[PDB]
Amino acid sequence: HWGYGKHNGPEHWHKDFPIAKGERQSPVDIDTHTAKYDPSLKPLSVSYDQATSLRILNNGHSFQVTFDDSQDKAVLKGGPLDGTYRLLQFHFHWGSLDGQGSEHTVDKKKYAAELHLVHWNTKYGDVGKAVQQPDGLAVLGIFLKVGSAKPGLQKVVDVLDSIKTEGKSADFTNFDPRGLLPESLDYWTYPGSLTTPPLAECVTWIVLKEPISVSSEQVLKFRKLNFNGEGEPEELMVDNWRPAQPLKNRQIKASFK
Ligand SMILES: COc1cc2c3c(ccc2cc1OS(N)(=O)=O)[C@@H]1CC[C@H](OS(N)(=O)=O)[C@@]1(C)C=C3
Ligand SMILES: [Zn+2]
């Protein structure tokens, strides 16, 4: 089964998922001098005041917080998007050292981690249908740098002991994802893919320019999770990021100058 190890990592994924070598794979390096400012792009509209978090889960490749997506409660609109996209989950990618961990890079700069807020287009009725469409998902990507602590992340950090190994989950209610956003919503956007199998080419990526800062003690606790299930040889969950893929026929747009 796929993973991030030497014998099952990203360089192997194309054997089971041949779309790994496709034309709109993610992540990419964002070349800030080649991205084009597009005045047609609109501000993002993030409406998370009514979000209902449900559960937090170690899925063996990351940890994720899931939300109730049965109604328009936490939605993303505007920017490059047509229509309304509902928040389903968020999860992170991070490194073994502070100089790596993000999936997207900016002028080849890697950040310590990257937060993905995954949303699906309500036109398609359920997330399984949306993954089959070129405009089915919108993922908001936020970089993490190491510095001052982020108070709104601490509730996540404190529960990670209870989901240390693959398949563990816990109730995780009343978590407000607004505490994870930077002050600015300036963004880059391009058409891309999921960065894990099945690598489907269904994602409008919206990558925020401004990182959030987290403390070294906060990111340390990510690195103590396990890829393995309980009672198996311990392997720390680190470096669960896919390296940058070829941009090919694509243009990255910026909402700012
Ligand atoms: C990082 O992993 C991501 C996985 C995503 C998935 C899905 C949607 C978004 C995902 C986003 C993921 O994050 S990431 N790194 O590209 O932003 C699936 C849609 C239907 C599918 O279910 S099925 N029956 O094929 O087992 C889902 C729920 C499975 C994975
Ligand atoms: Zn992700």
Enumerate the domain spans of the chain.
Answer: 1-257
Indicate whether residue 127 lines ligand 1 (CB < 6 A): yes
Is the bond into 182 cis (omega within 30 degrees of 0)?
no
What b/e readout covers 132-170, taking b as 16+ CB neighbours within 10 angstroms? eeebbbbbbbbbbbbeeebeebbbbbebbeebbbbebbe
Residues in the chain: 257
Tokens 């391009």 locate to 190
- Residues with a beta carbon under 5 angstroms from ion ligand 2: 116
Other C-beta atoms lying within 10 Å of the C-beta of residue 198: 15
Q: Which CATH architecture has domain 1-257?
A: Roll (3.10)
Annotated binding residues, written as ranges, equal 91, 93, 116, 195-196
Tokens of 214: 């987290």
Give residues with Cβ within 8 angstroms of 96, minimum separation 6. 223, 236, 238, 239
Going by their DSSP bridges, the two strands 53-58 and 169-171 should be labelled as antiparallel
Measure the CA–CA gap between 153 and 78, rounded to whole angstroms: 26
User: Separation of 74 CA from ligand 1 center, angstroms?
Assistant: 18
Site to substitute for ligand 1 among 93, 102, 196, 242, most atoms within 8 A of C-beta = 196
14 part of the active site: no
Measure the CA–CA gap between 146 and 176, rounded to whole angstroms: 22
Measure the CA–CA gap between 34 and 23, rounded to whole angstroms: 19
Tokens of 2: 């796929």
| Residues 203 and 135: beta-carbon distance below 8 Å | no
User: Separation of 156 CA from ligand 1 center, angstroms?
Assistant: 21
Indicate whether residue 59 lines ligand 1 (CB < 6 A): no
Q: Distance of CA 107 to CAs 35, 129, 208, 243, Å?
A: 11, 35, 14, 14
| Residues 90 and 65: beta-carbon distance below 8 Å | yes
Burial class (CB in 10 A: 0-12, 13-18, 19+), 103: buried
The reported resolution of this PDB entry, expressed in Å, is: 1.6
Tokens of 130: 């949306």
**Considering only CA atoms, which of 3, 156, 141 is closest in space to residue 66?**
156
**Considering only CA atoms, which of 245, 197, 211 is closest in space to residue 3?**
197
